[PDB]
Design a protein around this ligand. Sequence first.
Ligand SMILES: COc1cc(C(=O)O)cc([N+](=O)[O-])c1O
Ligand SMILES: COc1cc(C(=O)O)cc([N+](=O)[O-])c1O
Ligand SMILES: [Mn+2]
Ligand SMILES: [Mn+2]
Lengths: 335, 335
Amino acid sequence: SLRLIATEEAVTFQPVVDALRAHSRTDDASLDMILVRDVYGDEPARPAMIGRLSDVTGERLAEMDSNGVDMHLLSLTAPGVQMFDAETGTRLARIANDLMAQTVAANPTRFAGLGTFAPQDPASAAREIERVATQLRLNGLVINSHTNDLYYDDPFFHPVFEAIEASGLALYIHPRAPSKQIDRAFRDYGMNSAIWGYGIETSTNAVRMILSGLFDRFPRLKIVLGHMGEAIPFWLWRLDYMHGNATTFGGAPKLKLKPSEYFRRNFAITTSGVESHAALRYSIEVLGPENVMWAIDYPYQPMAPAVQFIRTAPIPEDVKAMVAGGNAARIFRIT
Amino acid sequence: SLRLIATEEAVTFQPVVDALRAHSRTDDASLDMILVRDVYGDEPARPAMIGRLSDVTGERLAEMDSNGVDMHLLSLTAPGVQMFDAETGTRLARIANDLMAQTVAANPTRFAGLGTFAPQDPASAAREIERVATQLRLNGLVINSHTNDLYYDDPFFHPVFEAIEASGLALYIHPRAPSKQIDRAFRDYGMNSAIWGYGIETSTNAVRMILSGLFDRFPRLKIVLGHMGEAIPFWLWRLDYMHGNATTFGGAPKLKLKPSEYFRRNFAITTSGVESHAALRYSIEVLGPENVMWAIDYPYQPMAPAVQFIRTAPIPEDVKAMVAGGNAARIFRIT
Ligand SMILES: COc1cc(C(=O)O)cc([N+](=O)[O-])c1O
Ligand SMILES: COc1cc(C(=O)O)cc([N+](=O)[O-])c1O
Ligand SMILES: [Mn+2]
Ligand SMILES: [Mn+2]
C-alpha cells in the first residue's frame, strides 16, 4: 500500500572505484582520506563496502523486496568525483552519469537516479548539468558538500548554480568529511564521519549559501539536505533572530527574505540516518509536510529499521504517504 | 505567580572591561577579537553594550520588575577571562568572582551567580573552583567553550574537571567564537557570532567531551548548555547510531553508556536565544522536563519576548514551573 521511495541511496561504479583505489595511495591531506582508505584502500578496514555499494540488482533489490520498498533514488557515493583533479573529475562524472542512466534504464520502476558533476571546473560542470537534465534525463543532481575546501557561497561556483537553476533539477547536497577549513577539530573519536563531522560540514555549507544571498541570485534553486536537514530545522529561530546583528555589524549582505524563509522556500530535507519520530514530527511542524522526505542511506544504514521507522510514524496516513514517497516523486520527477 | 529564574544572564565588571579594552589593541588572531573590538574597542560598533553588561541594579532590575522576572543567574560574559595569558587570567578570575559574590550579596533574592576560572592554568583554576564552591558559595560555574584553542576532552584539563566534579557545582559551558581549529569557515556573513559559529563551536566541544569518555572518568559532572542544548538534543539518535562505527573503526574509546545517555545523565539545557515552542516541546520530549531551563540571554536578547515565550508555552502548568525556575533552583542551588 504505502509507496516507499528511498532518497539517499548510495551506489558506485567500477571506473570510480578504480580511481579511488589509486587515490587511496596518495598523500592527499583531505579528511575524506580516512573513508577512502577504509573503503577503497589496499588494506581496507571496511572490505565489504565496495561490493555492497556496487550491487544494484542483487542483495540491494532482494532487500528492497523483503521490506516492501518500491524504489531507491541512487546517487554516486561520497566523495563522488570531487577529490580528483579537474580533468579527471570531469571525465569520470560523464562516465558515472552514463552508468547511472543505464542502471536506471535497466529497472526504471525500482530505480531513479541523481547525476553528479565535478565543480573543480565550474564551466565544464555547467555543461554536464545540462547534459544530465536534457540528454540523460536523470531525476536530479547530487554533490558532496565542499569542493577544493570551498563552500557554495563562493562566486567561483556561480556557473554551476546558474546551470542547476535553469535545469529545474533539485540538488541533493550530501555530506563529505569536514573541509580543510575546519577538519582540525574532527580528527578524533571518529568525528570525521557521520557521527558528527558530516553534519557540521554540510550544515555550515548550507548556512553560508543562505547568508551570502545565493538564493536571491538564484531564487528557483531547490536544495535537498539529508540527516533531518543537518539540524538546520532546529536552528531556524536563532538564524532569523540573529540575522539583524549579522547585517548590521557582521558584514552580512541584506537579503530579501529571512533565513528560515529561504530554508522553507528553497530547501527540502530527508530522514536519512535520523530514525526519530520526535525529530520527524518537529521537522514536519516547522517546515511543513511537503518538505520532508524519507530515505534509508543504504548501504551505510540497513533497510529494515528505516522502513519500520516510517511505517510506524505517529502521523496521519496522508502525511505519511507524502513523506514516504509522494514528496520525492514530485521533487525528483518520478512517475 | 510563575517563578522566573533566567539562567544565562551576562554581566561584566570594570577590571575585566579594562583588561579587554587593552586586549582589543593587540595582535591576537582569535576569532573572538571581532566581538572584543565591537564591544570593548576604542571605536566600538556596539558602544552601548559595556554599559548594559555592567548594569545590574538599574535598567536590568527595572526590566526584571516590569516583566515579572524573579531572578537573573549572572555570569561573566564571554569570552570571560580566557583570552588573557595564564597569570592575568588567573588574577582576573579571582577578582571577577569576588565582585560576582558581592553583586549577589547586595540583592540575593534577585540575583544568583556563577563563578568562572582560567583553564590556561588547570592547577590554579582547580584552586579557584574550590574557593568559588566553599568560600564564596556561588551557585555554579561558567566557562566559555574552548581555552587556548583546545577542547575539554584534552587531558590537560583533567585537574579542572576533577575539581568541578568534587565541588558539586554545575558548569555552564557558554559559547565563544569558533576556535582556531575551525575559525576559517566563520569569517564571513557575521558567522563568527551567535547566528552560527557560537553553536558549532560549543556543540563540537561538548560532543568531544562525551565521545572521549570524560563522563566515565567524572560521572558526577553536571554540564549546562544554552541555546536549546546547542542542537545536540536534535542529533541524539544519530550520535547513538553511529557510535558503533566510531568505536569499531574510528578509534573512539569504548564507553559505559550511549552518547545520548550521557547527554541525559550529565547535561541540562537552557532556552537562551531559542524562543521556539516547537523546539521547546521537542527538547522536553527527548530529554525529559527536568532537563530544560528557561533563560533570557540578557542583554544580548531583550527580556519581554523571552518572558512571554515561556509564559505562553503550550505545556502543562507544572512542567512550565519546572522550566521557568524549578529546575534552575535545583541545579544551581537557589532557595
Ligand atoms: C560515504 O558515504 C557515507 C558514509 C557513511 C559512513 O561511513 O558511515 C555514512 C553516510 N551517511 O550519509 O551518513 C554516507 O553517505
Ligand atoms: C559575548 O556574549 C554574547 C554575545 C552575543 C552577541 O554578540 O549577540 C550573544 C550571546 N549569546 O549567548 O547568544 C552572547 O552571550
Ligand atoms: Mn549518505
Ligand atoms: Mn549568552
